[model samples]
Every structure is written in structure tokens, then in C-alpha cells.
Target: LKTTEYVAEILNELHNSAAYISNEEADQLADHILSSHQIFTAGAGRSGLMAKSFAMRLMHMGFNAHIVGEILTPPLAEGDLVIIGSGSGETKSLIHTAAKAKSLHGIVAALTINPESSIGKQADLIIRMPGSPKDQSNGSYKTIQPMGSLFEQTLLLFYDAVILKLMEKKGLDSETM
Candidate 1:
């Protein structure tokens, strides 16, 4: 097998996948972060790892980004925004977390592969990530990557781009982050 072909295919899929997401959501996501009392993030497994990376960038950029489940994360209130990464949009724990956020009158912004899933339905805003979070025998995943790798990878890319956009919108350079 020619391994280099796999690299090219993966990159092509990633390039094509970006068009499926809404730029408007990126703008809106940035706006939410820019205006929140505190931005809390959560996810499960690999998705959770990406969420932590996102929080770091947010904090670096001088924004109030907090990773939930951390010892010192403050309680959610009316003006807070909880940003969750659940590729399926139905992660059991995060579903409950989003609900609790809403219970406290906070906004929920979900970045998920399934925009119509329970968490997506519950979210005040949805950032749709197109692809099967897990396996797909067809082109639905748009990549040869297995299980949820494609979704997780693309979501990280999306988050990084949002970080850059947030920096732009807030007039912050990387040095400021």
C-alpha cells in the first residue's frame, strides 16, 4: 500500500469538510465567548481533550475560558455560557450538564456532529460538524479514518479557527493571548 496516498486523501477530506459548517456559527460562537460572564467547556473522551485545548487558547487570549470538572470552576449563572463538544450530541453526562446550565438560565452552545440529537435540541445554539462521529461504511465520514477520529479531528480544526477568529474580533494578537 502507498501510505502517502492516505495522507493526501485525509487532507483533501478535511479541506472539503470545512465548507459544510456554518461560518455564521463561528461568528456567533465568538460573540458568545466575547460576551460571556464565564465560558465553561466540557466533553467526553477524545472530544474532551480537544475541549481542553480550546479552553487553553481562550484563556491564553485573555478570555475567561474554564474547563468544567476542574476543582475551581465557578458555578454557572444567568450570564454564563457552557460550550460542550459531543460529536454525537447525545453524550450522557454532557446532556445532563447542558440541562443544568439551562436550569440556571445560562446559554448552551453545542458543537456536534449530530445537530438534531438531544443535546443539540437542548442547545441555545448549535455548531454543526458534518460526518459520522464513529464509523461509516460510506463517504459520510469523508475520510479513511476509523471510528470518531474524523469528527474529533475536524472539530479541533474548527475550534482552532474559532480561536483565531475570536482573536481577530477581540483585536487580540497571539502575543496578547
Candidate 2:
């Protein structure tokens, strides 16, 4: 498919499978972000890269957000929020990092496809994507996509949506920064 077609398909799939969170849920998550002294985000591989992008956007929006593995980053502490992007909710590094975050009494929020996975169990709040392991494994080898493509795609888009929602809720404009 061409770039345009690919984007269209992805958007269509997102529309079809998007799990709309309730207004209360949105409020809760936004409150978590607004109240926290600092926000930490993590994932592994490509998902980790996506989390970095989210951290940048959060920082740009005036949040004290950092990617978990950065050398100069401090430890997550109580009242902080750790947002993890893990499609399978099973990446070893992510799970371990979440464990450590929880050890400090920090809150864990997971954006994932597998809500039933171990990391999901640990999350204080979870945003589950549309599909799970079955969708991940059905890909053709010719395409060479790794498992959880749908989940990863959904995760990035969902985080962007959350940012937009926060902007609106807080009466924040582009000039707010």
C-alpha cells in the first residue's frame, strides 16, 4: 500500500476498535497527570522510542516528564505516575521497571493490548488496546512485522489523544507554554 493508503487503513482500524474511556476515567487519568510532581514513561524496543516521544510532548506541555532509562533521570517516588507503553504488557524490562516504581509507592499506568498480562496486573490504571496475542501472531512473514503492531499503533495514537484531551480540559492553548 502507498503511504496515504496505509495511513487511511490504520485510521480506519483505530476508529473501528477504539475503546472509548468514560469521562470519569479521562478525568481520573488527567488528574493523575496534573497532580503528579513528575511523570516517568517507559517501554522496550520500538515502544520505548514511542514513549520517548510522549515524554517530549509532555515536557513541552509543561509537565516534568522523563523517559525511565535516561542516565540523568532520578528515581520515581510516591505520587509520581509511571506511564508504560507495552503492547504485550509482558516486556521484561518494562515489568521490572514498573515493579521498582511500585516499590517506591509510585502509580503505574499501562497502555497495552494485553490487559491480562503480568504488567497489566501491576498497573494502577490500564488503557487496553483493541486486540491481543491473536492479532499479533496472525501476520505474514513476508510483511515481517513483529507481534503487536496493532497495539503499538493504538498506543501512540491513544497517547496523542490523551494529550489533546488534557489540553482541552485544562484550557491550555498552544501559547500556554
Candidate 3:
């Protein structure tokens, strides 16, 4: 029963928090996608997996999108956009990639919970998310979940929302895939 209640509370919070993202920001993200030569996404662990999923959808929409660490993926170049998913914005791999992308004159965009982290500092645009409240050391094990679970889950949903908006504004349909 306690687990069920916790799940419900988390879902409710997710729904409420999503409402905070303004339509203007959504439009801005979509515009960036349309203007970029190619889109690359980077993250670590679960966030990395979600980033890959987002890249897949972007590809289906006929955008040049890819995951950062894939063997065949090319480096982000000038006019490219690097969309990073980092709940803490401190993930080492993501931070390093963002730095490289910037050095190459690519735009860096971040979806993160910690706006003060390394990746956040380098980002040209940041979509911040609400973080969990539990103390770090005891939080992951205490809950029946992994560390940063809520942040990761919420980030996935938020990205999907952004993708949906892009689809609408671009007039992309299932046949576009």
C-alpha cells in the first residue's frame, strides 16, 4: 500500500511540474531543431538511454539526429545542435561532450535538474527539471528505486512532449518516418 501511494504521489507531481514549461520555450526548442544542420544527444546511464530514444524519433522525422557515443556517429560540428540529457547536469561524460561540442562551434542545449552543474554552465539553452528531495547518500537505497529515478523519468516525458510539439509545428506525420 505504501508503494502504491508513493507511485501515485510521484505521478501527480510529474503532471503538475510539466505544466511549468512555457509554450515559448517549447517553440524555441523546435526552432533550434529546424535550424540546426544536425542534432546530437548525450547523457550517461538511464538518461543516456532516454537520449538515444529521442534521437530515434528525431531521425524518424527526417532530422539528422544521433547519439553521441555511437560508433558510427560523427562529432558535432559547426551549425549542429547538441541536446544533452543530464538530471544532475554533472555527469562527466555529458560535461566533456558538451565542452567538445562548444569548441567545435556547435550549440549546446541541456535538459537537467541542476542548473549549476558543469553541463549547465556550458549550455546555450537549459530546460531545468524539478529534483527529488531526499538526501543523496541515503536516498537511492532507501527508496525502492535507483538514484535519480524521478528526475530521469520526468526528463523522458518532458522530451517526448517537446517532440510532439515539434511534430505539430513541422507538420510531420507518421508517414514522414
Instruction: Please give each candidate's TM-score.
Output: 0.90, 0.84, 0.84
lDDT of 1 by residue, 120-141 (tens): 9889989988775452455554
- Candidate 1 weakest ten by summed lDDT: 132-141
Indicate which candidate wins on TM-score: 1
Candidate 3 runs further than 4 Å off: 2-7, 132-145, 174-177
Pairs clashing in candidate 3? none
Q: In candidate 2, what are the lDDT values of residues 1-177, reduced to their tens digit?
A: 688887777676666556543456556777798889999988888788888888889998989999999998897779899999887788898889888888889999987767779899888988765565464465411122345565666667767777887798889867785
Query: All models: lDDT?
Result: 0.84, 0.77, 0.79
Looking at model 3, report the run of 10 residues with the lowest lDDT sum: 134-143
Q: Would you give me the overall lDDT of model 1? A: 0.84
Between candidates 1 and 2, the one scoring higher on TM-score is: 1
Scored against the true structure, residue 14 in model 3 reaches a CA lDDT of 62
What does candidate 3's lDDT look like per residue over 132-151, in tens digits?
34333534312334667767
Clashes of each: 1, 0, 0
Candidate topping lDDT = 1
